[PDB]
Short mmCIF file of C-alpha atoms in Angstrom, two decimals:
data_model
loop_
_atom_site.label_atom_id
_atom_site.label_comp_id
_atom_site.label_asym_id
_atom_site.label_seq_id
_atom_site.Cartn_x
_atom_site.Cartn_y
_atom_site.Cartn_z
CA UNK A 11 2.58 -20.04 -25.33
CA UNK A 12 3.27 -17.31 -22.81
CA UNK A 13 6.29 -15.00 -22.94
CA UNK A 14 9.14 -15.48 -20.59
CA UNK A 15 10.58 -12.81 -18.28
CA UNK A 16 14.18 -11.85 -19.17
CA UNK A 17 16.98 -11.06 -16.72
CA UNK A 18 19.70 -8.51 -17.61
CA UNK A 19 22.90 -7.31 -16.22
CA UNK A 20 24.23 -3.80 -17.07
CA UNK A 21 28.04 -4.28 -17.13
CA UNK A 22 28.51 -0.75 -15.98
CA UNK A 23 26.47 -1.31 -12.75
CA UNK A 24 27.52 -3.45 -9.78
CA UNK A 25 25.76 -6.88 -9.66
CA UNK A 26 25.10 -8.70 -6.39
CA UNK A 27 25.21 -12.58 -6.29
CA UNK A 28 21.81 -12.90 -4.64
CA UNK A 29 20.10 -10.23 -6.61
CA UNK A 30 18.52 -9.96 -10.06
CA UNK A 31 19.71 -6.55 -11.32
CA UNK A 32 17.17 -6.15 -14.08
CA UNK A 33 14.04 -8.02 -15.10
CA UNK A 34 11.85 -7.33 -18.27
CA UNK A 35 8.40 -8.82 -18.73
CA UNK A 36 5.70 -7.62 -21.16
CA UNK A 37 7.23 -4.24 -21.81
CA UNK A 38 7.72 -3.44 -18.13
CA UNK A 39 11.15 -3.36 -16.40
CA UNK A 40 11.73 -4.34 -12.69
CA UNK A 41 15.02 -3.66 -10.74
CA UNK A 42 16.53 -5.29 -7.94
CA UNK A 43 17.59 -3.11 -4.89
CA UNK A 44 19.88 -0.34 -5.88
CA UNK A 45 22.40 1.22 -3.37
CA UNK A 46 25.33 3.70 -3.53
CA UNK A 47 28.06 1.26 -4.77
CA UNK A 48 29.97 1.96 -7.96
CA UNK A 49 31.04 -0.65 -10.62
CA UNK A 50 34.35 -1.24 -8.75
CA UNK A 51 32.39 -2.42 -5.68
CA UNK A 52 33.17 0.71 -3.69
CA UNK A 53 30.47 2.05 -1.33
CA UNK A 54 30.57 5.74 -1.58
CA UNK A 55 30.86 7.89 1.71
CA UNK A 56 27.96 9.72 3.10
CA UNK A 57 24.26 10.10 2.39
CA UNK A 58 24.74 12.54 -0.70
CA UNK A 59 27.23 10.46 -2.64
CA UNK A 60 25.39 7.20 -1.91
CA UNK A 61 22.23 8.83 -3.22
CA UNK A 62 23.86 10.18 -6.39
CA UNK A 63 25.44 6.86 -7.10
CA UNK A 64 22.10 4.91 -6.37
CA UNK A 65 20.23 6.88 -8.97
CA UNK A 66 23.02 6.76 -11.50
CA UNK A 67 22.82 2.88 -11.15
CA UNK A 68 19.01 3.08 -11.61
CA UNK A 69 19.35 5.33 -14.70
CA UNK A 70 22.01 3.11 -16.36
CA UNK A 71 20.07 -0.16 -15.55
CA UNK A 72 16.77 1.42 -17.07
CA UNK A 73 18.49 2.77 -20.20
CA UNK A 74 20.18 -0.64 -20.71
CA UNK A 75 16.71 -2.18 -20.58
CA UNK A 76 15.27 0.16 -23.10
CA UNK A 77 13.67 2.32 -20.39
CA UNK A 78 14.73 5.47 -18.63
CA UNK A 79 14.19 7.60 -15.40
CA UNK A 80 11.27 9.42 -17.10
CA UNK A 81 9.63 6.00 -17.66
CA UNK A 82 9.64 5.02 -14.01
CA UNK A 83 6.03 4.39 -12.74
CA UNK A 84 6.71 3.60 -9.14
CA UNK A 85 9.72 3.17 -6.56
CA UNK A 86 10.20 2.73 -2.87
CA UNK A 87 12.89 4.36 -0.69
CA UNK A 88 14.29 2.81 2.40
CA UNK A 89 16.46 5.30 4.38
CA UNK A 90 18.61 4.01 7.20
CA UNK A 91 17.14 4.30 10.69
CA UNK A 92 20.55 6.03 11.52
CA UNK A 93 19.87 9.08 9.40
CA UNK A 94 19.49 12.56 10.87
CA UNK A 95 16.63 14.86 9.95
CA UNK A 96 19.23 16.84 7.82
CA UNK A 97 20.33 13.64 5.96
CA UNK A 98 16.77 12.72 5.12
CA UNK A 99 16.12 16.24 4.00
CA UNK A 100 19.19 16.19 1.76
CA UNK A 101 18.12 12.99 0.19
CA UNK A 102 14.81 14.70 -0.91
CA UNK A 103 16.70 17.67 -2.20
CA UNK A 104 18.83 15.35 -4.34
CA UNK A 105 15.78 13.35 -5.31
CA UNK A 106 14.14 16.43 -6.70
CA UNK A 107 17.42 16.95 -8.82
CA UNK A 108 16.86 13.49 -10.41
CA UNK A 109 13.09 13.89 -10.87
CA UNK A 110 12.89 17.72 -11.76
CA UNK A 111 9.38 17.99 -12.99
CA UNK A 112 6.90 18.15 -10.09
CA UNK A 113 4.00 17.19 -12.23
CA UNK A 114 5.50 13.83 -13.47
CA UNK A 115 7.33 12.66 -10.39
CA UNK A 116 6.85 8.77 -10.07
CA UNK A 117 4.71 7.05 -7.36
CA UNK A 118 6.79 6.96 -4.31
CA UNK A 119 6.97 5.88 -0.60
CA UNK A 120 9.67 6.43 1.92
CA UNK A 121 10.24 4.83 5.22
CA UNK A 122 13.18 4.20 7.83
CA UNK A 123 14.58 0.64 8.03
CA UNK A 124 17.65 -1.17 9.34
CA UNK A 125 19.71 -1.64 6.01
CA UNK A 126 22.78 -3.79 5.47
CA UNK A 127 26.13 -2.62 6.77
CA UNK A 128 27.20 0.84 5.66
CA UNK A 129 24.09 1.48 3.65
CA UNK A 130 22.45 4.86 4.24
CA UNK A 131 19.84 4.69 1.49
CA UNK A 132 18.38 1.86 -0.71
CA UNK A 133 15.86 2.30 -3.58
CA UNK A 134 13.81 -0.81 -4.27
CA UNK A 135 10.69 -1.91 -6.29
CA UNK A 136 11.59 0.33 -9.15
CA UNK A 137 8.95 -0.40 -11.94
CA UNK A 138 9.35 1.23 -15.33
CA UNK A 139 7.81 1.17 -18.72
CA UNK A 140 9.99 0.26 -21.84
CA UNK A 141 10.14 2.74 -24.64
CA UNK B 14 -12.22 -7.38 -11.97
CA UNK B 15 -9.11 -9.23 -10.69
CA UNK B 16 -9.14 -12.90 -10.24
CA UNK B 17 -8.24 -14.14 -6.84
CA UNK B 18 -7.30 -17.79 -6.11
CA UNK B 19 -6.48 -19.92 -3.01
CA UNK B 20 -4.18 -22.89 -3.38
CA UNK B 21 -5.75 -25.64 -1.14
CA UNK B 22 -2.26 -26.79 -0.09
CA UNK B 23 -1.10 -23.42 1.24
CA UNK B 24 -2.35 -21.51 4.28
CA UNK B 25 -4.74 -18.74 3.67
CA UNK B 26 -4.85 -15.63 6.04
CA UNK B 27 -8.13 -13.96 6.77
CA UNK B 28 -7.04 -10.41 5.78
CA UNK B 29 -4.75 -11.41 3.05
CA UNK B 30 -5.41 -12.27 -0.73
CA UNK B 31 -3.26 -15.29 -1.42
CA UNK B 32 -2.94 -15.18 -5.12
CA UNK B 33 -4.21 -12.64 -7.73
CA UNK B 34 -3.98 -13.23 -11.55
CA UNK B 35 -4.15 -10.27 -13.89
CA UNK B 36 -3.44 -10.04 -17.54
CA UNK B 37 -1.00 -13.03 -17.44
CA UNK B 38 0.94 -11.80 -14.34
CA UNK B 39 0.60 -13.46 -10.91
CA UNK B 40 0.79 -11.49 -7.53
CA UNK B 41 1.04 -13.03 -4.14
CA UNK B 42 0.16 -12.03 -0.67
CA UNK B 43 2.80 -12.06 2.01
CA UNK B 44 4.24 -15.50 2.64
CA UNK B 45 5.74 -16.79 5.89
CA UNK B 46 6.86 -20.11 7.32
CA UNK B 47 3.43 -21.57 8.21
CA UNK B 48 2.33 -24.86 6.88
CA UNK B 49 -1.11 -25.89 5.52
CA UNK B 50 -2.25 -26.79 8.99
CA UNK B 51 -1.42 -23.34 10.25
CA UNK B 52 1.72 -24.45 12.31
CA UNK B 53 4.32 -21.81 12.36
CA UNK B 54 7.76 -23.68 11.94
CA UNK B 55 10.46 -22.90 14.51
CA UNK B 56 13.84 -21.29 13.38
CA UNK B 57 15.00 -19.43 10.33
CA UNK B 58 15.92 -22.54 8.43
CA UNK B 59 12.52 -24.27 8.58
CA UNK B 60 10.69 -20.95 8.25
CA UNK B 61 12.71 -20.10 5.08
CA UNK B 62 12.04 -23.45 3.41
CA UNK B 63 8.37 -23.38 4.28
CA UNK B 64 7.95 -19.89 2.97
CA UNK B 65 9.48 -20.66 -0.47
CA UNK B 66 7.54 -23.92 -0.61
CA UNK B 67 4.43 -21.92 -0.05
CA UNK B 68 5.40 -19.40 -2.78
CA UNK B 69 6.28 -22.41 -5.08
CA UNK B 70 2.82 -24.11 -4.67
CA UNK B 71 0.82 -20.83 -4.99
CA UNK B 72 2.66 -19.95 -8.25
CA UNK B 73 2.21 -23.52 -9.62
CA UNK B 74 -1.43 -23.43 -8.85
CA UNK B 75 -1.78 -20.52 -11.12
CA UNK B 76 0.43 -22.10 -13.84
CA UNK B 77 3.46 -19.96 -12.89
CA UNK B 78 6.49 -21.16 -11.00
CA UNK B 79 9.64 -20.01 -9.03
CA UNK B 80 11.51 -19.62 -12.39
CA UNK B 81 9.01 -17.01 -13.74
CA UNK B 82 9.34 -14.71 -10.60
CA UNK B 83 10.34 -11.22 -11.71
CA UNK B 84 10.62 -9.59 -8.32
CA UNK B 85 10.14 -10.21 -4.57
CA UNK B 86 11.02 -8.43 -1.27
CA UNK B 87 12.51 -10.02 1.82
CA UNK B 88 11.86 -8.82 5.43
CA UNK B 89 14.19 -10.55 7.90
CA UNK B 90 13.59 -10.08 11.70
CA UNK B 91 15.76 -7.43 13.33
CA UNK B 92 16.49 -10.12 15.99
CA UNK B 93 18.56 -12.26 13.36
CA UNK B 94 22.26 -12.41 13.80
CA UNK B 95 24.66 -11.85 10.85
CA UNK B 96 25.20 -15.64 10.60
CA UNK B 97 21.44 -16.22 10.46
CA UNK B 98 21.24 -13.71 7.48
CA UNK B 99 24.06 -15.56 5.94
CA UNK B 100 22.23 -18.84 6.39
CA UNK B 101 19.07 -17.36 4.95
CA UNK B 102 21.02 -16.42 1.82
CA UNK B 103 22.55 -19.80 1.45
CA UNK B 104 19.07 -21.39 1.60
CA UNK B 105 17.75 -18.64 -0.81
CA UNK B 106 20.55 -19.77 -3.37
CA UNK B 107 19.24 -23.42 -2.91
CA UNK B 108 15.78 -22.29 -3.96
CA UNK B 109 17.05 -20.02 -6.88
CA UNK B 110 19.94 -22.16 -7.92
CA UNK B 111 20.38 -20.78 -11.38
CA UNK B 112 22.40 -17.55 -10.92
CA UNK B 113 21.63 -15.79 -14.05
CA UNK B 114 17.78 -16.03 -13.61
CA UNK B 115 17.63 -14.96 -10.00
CA UNK B 116 14.66 -12.42 -9.61
CA UNK B 117 14.87 -8.87 -8.68
CA UNK B 118 15.12 -8.57 -4.94
CA UNK B 119 15.70 -6.39 -1.90
CA UNK B 120 16.24 -7.47 1.74
CA UNK B 121 15.88 -5.34 4.85
CA UNK B 122 15.41 -5.95 8.55
CA UNK B 123 12.02 -5.24 10.12
CA UNK B 124 9.81 -5.83 13.23
CA UNK B 125 7.66 -8.81 12.02
CA UNK B 126 4.57 -10.25 13.66
CA UNK B 127 4.91 -12.56 16.71
CA UNK B 128 7.18 -15.62 16.04
CA UNK B 129 8.07 -14.66 12.54
CA UNK B 130 11.80 -14.60 11.50
CA UNK B 131 11.23 -14.10 7.69
CA UNK B 132 8.50 -12.77 5.41
CA UNK B 133 8.60 -12.74 1.51
CA UNK B 134 6.27 -10.05 -0.02
CA UNK B 135 5.56 -8.38 -3.26
CA UNK B 136 6.19 -11.55 -5.29
CA UNK B 137 5.43 -10.80 -8.92
CA UNK B 138 5.52 -13.54 -11.51
CA UNK B 139 4.64 -14.16 -15.07
CA UNK B 140 2.27 -16.95 -16.18
CA UNK B 141 3.64 -19.95 -18.09
CA UNK C 14 6.08 8.25 -20.95
CA UNK C 15 3.55 6.88 -18.36
CA UNK C 16 0.51 9.01 -17.49
CA UNK C 17 0.68 10.75 -14.07
CA UNK C 18 -2.53 11.95 -12.56
CA UNK C 19 -3.65 13.98 -9.62
CA UNK C 20 -7.08 13.66 -8.07
CA UNK C 21 -7.86 17.12 -6.90
CA UNK C 22 -9.80 15.90 -3.94
CA UNK C 23 -6.77 14.07 -2.39
CA UNK C 24 -3.55 15.55 -1.10
CA UNK C 25 -0.47 15.57 -3.36
CA UNK C 26 3.04 15.63 -1.76
CA UNK C 27 5.88 17.52 -3.34
CA UNK C 28 8.23 14.40 -3.81
CA UNK C 29 5.42 11.95 -4.70
CA UNK C 30 3.42 10.97 -7.71
CA UNK C 31 -0.09 10.49 -6.55
CA UNK C 32 -1.33 8.27 -9.34
CA UNK C 33 0.25 6.51 -12.39
CA UNK C 34 -1.55 4.75 -15.21
CA UNK C 35 0.19 2.34 -17.49
CA UNK C 36 -1.20 -0.38 -19.73
CA UNK C 37 -4.57 -0.51 -18.04
CA UNK C 38 -2.99 -0.72 -14.59
CA UNK C 39 -2.97 1.93 -11.83
CA UNK C 40 -0.23 2.50 -9.30
CA UNK C 41 -0.38 4.85 -6.35
CA UNK C 42 2.15 6.83 -4.37
CA UNK C 43 2.17 6.26 -0.62
CA UNK C 44 -1.12 7.15 1.10
CA UNK C 45 -1.54 8.39 4.73
CA UNK C 46 -4.22 9.89 6.91
CA UNK C 47 -3.91 13.50 5.62
CA UNK C 48 -6.94 15.22 4.26
CA UNK C 49 -7.16 17.43 1.08
CA UNK C 50 -6.15 20.58 2.95
CA UNK C 51 -2.98 18.83 4.31
CA UNK C 52 -4.22 18.15 7.79
CA UNK C 53 -3.07 14.94 9.48
CA UNK C 54 -5.92 13.49 11.47
CA UNK C 55 -5.61 12.50 15.10
CA UNK C 56 -5.68 8.78 16.17
CA UNK C 57 -5.34 5.45 14.49
CA UNK C 58 -9.08 5.15 13.25
CA UNK C 59 -9.22 8.64 11.57
CA UNK C 60 -5.85 8.16 9.96
CA UNK C 61 -6.92 4.60 8.77
CA UNK C 62 -10.28 5.72 7.31
CA UNK C 63 -8.66 8.87 5.62
CA UNK C 64 -5.91 6.67 4.10
CA UNK C 65 -8.46 4.30 2.48
CA UNK C 66 -10.72 7.28 1.51
CA UNK C 67 -7.58 8.78 -0.25
CA UNK C 68 -6.97 5.42 -1.99
CA UNK C 69 -10.57 5.05 -2.96
CA UNK C 70 -10.77 8.62 -4.40
CA UNK C 71 -7.48 8.22 -6.44
CA UNK C 72 -8.47 4.88 -7.88
CA UNK C 73 -11.93 6.08 -8.98
CA UNK C 74 -10.36 9.09 -10.56
CA UNK C 75 -8.08 6.78 -12.64
CA UNK C 76 -11.07 4.65 -13.91
CA UNK C 77 -10.51 2.02 -11.17
CA UNK C 78 -11.75 1.47 -7.51
CA UNK C 79 -11.23 -0.28 -4.29
CA UNK C 80 -12.77 -3.55 -5.78
CA UNK C 81 -10.08 -3.45 -8.48
CA UNK C 82 -7.03 -3.56 -6.22
CA UNK C 83 -4.71 -6.34 -6.82
CA UNK C 84 -2.05 -5.81 -4.15
CA UNK C 85 -1.12 -3.35 -1.43
CA UNK C 86 1.44 -3.14 1.40
CA UNK C 87 0.78 -1.69 4.87
CA UNK C 88 3.37 -0.07 7.23
CA UNK C 89 1.99 0.43 10.71
CA UNK C 90 4.04 2.58 13.15
CA UNK C 91 6.48 0.71 15.46
CA UNK C 92 4.73 2.70 18.34
CA UNK C 93 1.57 0.88 17.86
CA UNK C 94 0.40 -1.61 20.52
CA UNK C 95 -1.10 -5.12 19.79
CA UNK C 96 -4.59 -3.88 20.50
CA UNK C 97 -4.22 -0.94 18.03
CA UNK C 98 -2.84 -3.26 15.37
CA UNK C 99 -6.03 -5.40 15.90
CA UNK C 100 -8.15 -2.25 15.74
CA UNK C 101 -6.57 -1.44 12.34
CA UNK C 102 -7.27 -4.92 10.99
CA UNK C 103 -11.03 -4.69 12.13
CA UNK C 104 -11.17 -1.40 10.18
CA UNK C 105 -9.41 -2.95 7.21
CA UNK C 106 -12.16 -5.69 7.19
CA UNK C 107 -14.81 -2.90 7.18
CA UNK C 108 -13.27 -1.38 4.05
CA UNK C 109 -12.54 -4.70 2.33
CA UNK C 110 -15.74 -6.54 3.49
CA UNK C 111 -15.91 -9.20 0.85
CA UNK C 112 -13.53 -11.85 2.21
CA UNK C 113 -12.83 -13.62 -1.12
CA UNK C 114 -11.75 -10.61 -3.13
CA UNK C 115 -9.40 -9.00 -0.44
CA UNK C 116 -6.33 -7.79 -2.26
CA UNK C 117 -2.83 -9.42 -1.92
CA UNK C 118 -1.51 -7.83 1.29
CA UNK C 119 1.44 -7.67 3.57
CA UNK C 120 1.78 -5.68 6.87
CA UNK C 121 4.97 -4.89 8.80
CA UNK C 122 5.95 -2.28 11.43
CA UNK C 123 8.37 0.53 10.36
CA UNK C 124 9.46 3.94 11.56
CA UNK C 125 7.22 6.33 9.62
CA UNK C 126 7.60 10.09 8.99
CA UNK C 127 6.47 12.39 11.84
CA UNK C 128 2.92 11.86 13.31
CA UNK C 129 2.10 8.91 10.97
CA UNK C 130 0.51 5.81 12.60
CA UNK C 131 -0.25 3.98 9.31
CA UNK C 132 0.87 4.30 5.75
CA UNK C 133 -0.43 2.21 2.65
CA UNK C 134 2.01 1.72 -0.25
CA UNK C 135 2.59 -0.07 -3.41
CA UNK C 136 -1.23 -0.13 -4.28
CA UNK C 137 -1.63 -1.69 -7.64
CA UNK C 138 -5.06 -1.95 -9.27
CA UNK C 139 -6.69 -2.85 -12.61
CA UNK C 140 -8.64 -0.38 -14.60
CA UNK C 141 -12.41 -0.87 -15.24
#
């Protein structure tokens, strides 16, 4: 028999009806899309606060799933098509505060897309190893 | 070297590997609302149902299934209205009807190839 | 923690892990038509060829190769015409010239960073 994937919900991170928050399979963790919404369901104001909240959500989910930010292998970034050059640059400044070791930064891509209402940034396809 | 499969009952695109099996995991190429004969169905409803039928058949051909999907990505056409996006999600919940085991997902708008209203990509699933 | 590698013959971007190896699988950061010196090539063909050359070099550096790719995603610039997208796919079939082993693929238009006509992301490959 083969092992089942397991689906988890970190109680300190917002959970969306249509979206698996965390999946674990064969020592690997996958996350559903993460956005700058706190546990109370409040979307934070501006690129910076949405970015900080997004990576806080990711950190909490990964640690809940026996992983962590330093175990992320790959992730994708969707920035809103509405963002200015300064907002995109600020995102990357904040990104480097989350992943502070240049040598071990995870695989990344980043493109502009039309996100759901109010969203300035979304981080998707987070793949991480378990501890 | 990775094993590539083609389910005979699902459309196969020239440039696109349909199914890959690697170390008990199944990966799929992009899926759209085109049936076995190569006919693109009209409208979001029919395209959505056909897309997930394609995914289901591909996964079952590799002894996986919808219930063993860990993650997927959705691209909806930029042309879709809010009500169309809402309708997509209603249909999505009819495919994944067990709330607790819904796969990781993300959903954004994109400029898709001609005629396409929805595309589901990066489907990753475990073998049963 | 997972092993991150840098192939010294391929450009590395400040914010971007170039190569990650985990449990006999290789993941790549986004690849674009920029050479080792950091020069973005002019035109779709040269950017396309450079992008897949970068991918080839990274995979071979990580005990893998183009023939071990399981899945990848393509983002083409929204500025590209239909004829240019067709040209990209011709070039794609030159690189992946064995039809049966072409990796899982999806391809959509997106607004890429300055100057970029094509970007290949989410490359996942098995190790030898």
